[PDB]
């Protein structure tokens, strides 16, 4: 048969089989299990520090691996490295393109990445013999704006772009070694696994995918949202992750079961979620919102346990230190705060 | 601090110098004009509007000791709503439309001529949430084709409910009014119109006058008097 009639119906039955298999392995909800445990009391946090000096909106930040330094990117074409203990500026790096939308910190402390609205990811060298900060490599192989970038080691980095592709690079040569394809809409974020052997991404077609870094193509696909996905993060264990979309909701997904676990929403919340982060023990889930304030969720019972108010505009960034000492939040009014 | 060591005062001084540099360079970026250059497909924006002087594409020029920055986002080809709020503080928006298009149909859809989706794009951009109080500069290019096309093929092809003299001036005025009536704010936003074609100067001057007016009105509203 020349016409493609029978092959079109093949995908319809295959989708049903996965749906049926998922239902067959749903014994009980998470609420029924974590019901008798003692709920966490009210969580009160105070603004210990307030870092100022940015003159425009702040779009991203990343914590250092020693839990003392952090980097911040703003739409005035500046990268700043802070000292959170003493509120000191260690470096100030000017950018060639001021439309930056992401930033990252090397897990060794020698390198810093950038990019956005230019299809180009720039790598900066911090430990330099002549005493300044210079751009070392300039990766350019994308056709859409850059959304996220995460360092693998001193010589590998993975980026996601708005052209529905993610790429694994080799900074020594500057050439893509693997390309991850399959997303329909633009990809907005990604999260690296604790062991750096897998990663997940969220795109504008309201879906999430789990990739394999070594071999290089998709393994599982998670659905359930009803709008764009702007934030994603990994559970500290490594067997779950959480997504934050644009329909004023957050969700928890399980890799080993391919199931919905929990939903974190309330009636008086109608704006979207811009950020998501976890706690060291994996008990507190923090999320930023467009109603100018952040929220703290008890991840085991879905109840709300606190509010982080004090920002005068949208909350766009959110991060927790490696030792769980503090929490930093950025916002569109050009102020960062540390909460303890 | 009276308890700081010898190697912490130097760090504090370094931070002070960093802050001074940031502040000094941050007041030079408030004395330049940022123009988001939009337009339609094959509307002649690159022919004259981007040629009138000397991913994202950026252009710089100076006219009567005032600094301009033009941002061309024609080649992006992505979801517009995910990055349209980046240009939330631009001074104005430049729009280029070819009015010799009323007879020419779209290269992909033959149902309607490209003027209709040009109007649709203008409506969508003008009534945006992020551009409530940002004025718009409107350009009507390649007017050397319009009169000789209208002397044979009249405006009835594009506008069937129009009744006029079928001359150049009346048709141009009707098109200008049709485009200007799409505004829905009428109190916080103003539209400036111009006929460009390919003429010697008279474009940078128009942009300079419009941005001077916008700056004056913005300062007047900010200082209290409104």
């Amino acid at each position, epitope marked *: 048969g020349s016409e493609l009639d029978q092959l079109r119906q093949e995908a319809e039955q295959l989708k049903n089989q996965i749906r049926d298999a998922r239902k067959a392995c749903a014994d009980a909800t998470l609420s029924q299990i974590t019901n008798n445990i003692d709920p966490v009391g009210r969580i009160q946090m105070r603004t210990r520090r307030t870092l100022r000096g940015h003159l425009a909106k702040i779009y991203a930040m990343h914590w250092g691996t020693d839990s003392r*330094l952090l980097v911040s990117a703003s739409q005035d074409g500046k990268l700043i490295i802070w000292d959170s203990y003493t509120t000191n500026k*260690v470096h100030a790096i000017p950018l060639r393109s001021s439309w930056v939308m992401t930033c990252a910190y090397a897990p060794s402390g020698n390198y810093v990445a950038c990019g956005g609205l230019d299809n180009i990811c720039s790598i900066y060298n911090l430990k330099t013999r*002549e*005493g*300044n900060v210079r751009v070392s490599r300039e990766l350019a192989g994308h056709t859409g704006y850059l959304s996220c970038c995460r360092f693998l080691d001193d010589n590998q980095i993975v980026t996601s772009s708005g052209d529905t592709t993610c790429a694994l690079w080799d900074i020594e040569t500057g050439q893509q070694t693997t390309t991850f394809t399959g997303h329909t809409g633009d990809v907005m974020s990604l999260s690296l696994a604790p062991d750096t052997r897998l990663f997940v991404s969220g795109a504008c077609d309201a879906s999430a995918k789990l990739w394999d870094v070594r071999e290089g193509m998709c393994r599982q696909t998670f659905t359930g949202h009803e709008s764009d996905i702007n934030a994603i993060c990994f559970f500290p264990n490594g067997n779950a992750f959480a997504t934050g979309s644009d329909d004023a909701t957050c969700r928890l997904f399980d890799l080993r079961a391919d199931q919905e676990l929990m939903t974190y929403s309330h009636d008086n919340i109608i704006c979207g979620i811009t950020s998501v982060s976890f706690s060291k023990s994996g008990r507190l889930l923090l999320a930023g919102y467009d109603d100018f304030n952040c929220n703290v969720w008890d991840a085991l019972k879905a109840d709300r346990a606190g509010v982080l108010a004090g920002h005068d505009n949208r909350v766009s960034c959110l991060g927790v230190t490696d030792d769980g000492m503090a929490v930093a939040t950025g916002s569109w009014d050009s102020f960062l705060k540390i909460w303890n | 601090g009276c308890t700081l*060591s*010898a190697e912490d005062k*130097a*760090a504090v001084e370094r931070s002070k110098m960093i802050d001074r540099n940031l502040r000094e360079d941050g007041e030079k970026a408030a004395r330049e004009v940022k123009l988001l250059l939009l337009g339609a497909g094959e509307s002649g924006k690159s022919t004259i509007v981007k040629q009138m002087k000397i991913g994202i594409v950026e252009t710089h020029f100076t006219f009567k000791d005032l600094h301009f920055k033009m941002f061309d986002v024609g080649g992006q080809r992505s979801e517009r709503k995910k990055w349209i709020h980046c240009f939330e503080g631009v001074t104005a928006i430049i729009f280029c439309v070819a009015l010799s298009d009323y007879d020419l149909v779209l290269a992909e859809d033959e149902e309607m001529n490209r003027m209709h989706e040009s109007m649709k794009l203008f409506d969508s951009i003008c009534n945006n949430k992020w551009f409530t109080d940002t004025s718009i500069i409107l350009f009507l290019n390649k007017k050397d084709l319009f009169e000789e096309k209208i002397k044979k093929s009249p405006l009835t092809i594009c506008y069937p409910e129009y009744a006029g003299s079928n001359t150049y001036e009346e048709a141009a005025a009707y098109i200008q009014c049709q485009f200007e009536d799409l505004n829905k704010r009428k109190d916080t936003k103003e539209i400036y119109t111009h006929f460009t074609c390919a003429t010697d100067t008279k474009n940078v001057q128009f942009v300079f006058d419009a941005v001077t007016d916008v700056i004056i009105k913005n300062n007047l509203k900010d200082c209290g008097l409104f």
Partner: single-chain antibody, 232 residues
Framework: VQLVESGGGLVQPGGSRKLSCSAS????????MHWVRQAPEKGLEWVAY????????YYADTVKGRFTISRDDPKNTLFLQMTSLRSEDTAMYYC??????????????WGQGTTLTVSSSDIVMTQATSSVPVTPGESVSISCRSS???????????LYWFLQRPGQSPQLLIY???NLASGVPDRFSGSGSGTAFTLTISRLEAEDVGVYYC?????????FGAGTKLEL
């Protein structure tokens, strides 16, 4: 990186001399600069310090009001105004760069120096065993002591170690008593507790022969100790 000094020579007592150094190969405008003195067959002696941006200037008690330091940012030149002299300043003057931020390592590049043969509450750091016979392939330990505790409230321990090979300029080995410098072998190590410090070096070679100094940076003025000349 490069630092070349010029302006030496003999000076009759009471006169004045001009000293300058030229920096080429690094961002000179973000690095504090020092002057360090060494008399013939004696130890090191800190002299002055000018910060980044000419904000803070310090001096030694011996030269306060008599020596002046100046910076020339556009052409990357560091000066030292030298007023009325005596028959005591006969020594060799070095130039050292230093940068201060969280995690930096001051006293990286030490320049070369220029001969200056003149015609005719402070913390105390002590070193012993000025001469120690050593053999290759073994391990030897060096000890330095202080009067006041160098442990600050923030946890830092401002103790430094340097090496002056025969006929060469001092080079940094260990900064803040625990961190190894850049471009040095892993054999060297350092340890201490509060007041007593010990430098551990194992598997010496022919290039390990020289004099080792201990310096404190807790507060100004900076005091240099004596040295131990390792001999084959």
């Amino acid at each position: 990186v490069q630092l070349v000094e010029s302006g030496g020579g003999l000076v009759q007592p009471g006169g004045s001399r001009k000293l300058s150094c030229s920096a080429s190969g690094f961002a000179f405008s973000s690095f504090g600069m020092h002057w360090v003195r060494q008399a013939p067959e004696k130890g090191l002696e800190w002299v002055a310090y000018i910060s980044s941006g000419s904000g803070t200037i310090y001096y030694a008690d011996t030269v306060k009001g008599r020596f002046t330091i100046s910076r020339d940012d556009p052409k990357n030149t560091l000066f030292l105004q030298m007023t009325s002299l005596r028959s005591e300043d006969t020594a060799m003057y070095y130039c050292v760069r230093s940068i201060y931020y969280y995690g930096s390592s001051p006293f990286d590049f030490w320049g070369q120096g220029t001969t200056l043969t003149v015609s005719s509450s402070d913390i105390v750091m002590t070193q012993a065993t000025s001469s120690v016979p050593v053999t290759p392939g073994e391990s030897v330990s060096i000890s330095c002591r202080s009067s006041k505790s160098l442990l600050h409230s923030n946890g830092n321990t401002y103790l430094y170690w340097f090496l002056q090979r025969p006929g060469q300029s001092p080079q940094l080995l260990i900064y803040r008593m625990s961190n190894l410098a850049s471009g040095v072998p892993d054999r060297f190590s350092g340890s201490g507790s509060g007041t007593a410090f010990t430098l551990t070096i194992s598997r010496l070679e022919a290039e390990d022969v020289g004099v080792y100094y201990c310096m404190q940076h807790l507060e100004y003025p900076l005091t240099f100790g004596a040295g131990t000349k390792l001999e084959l």
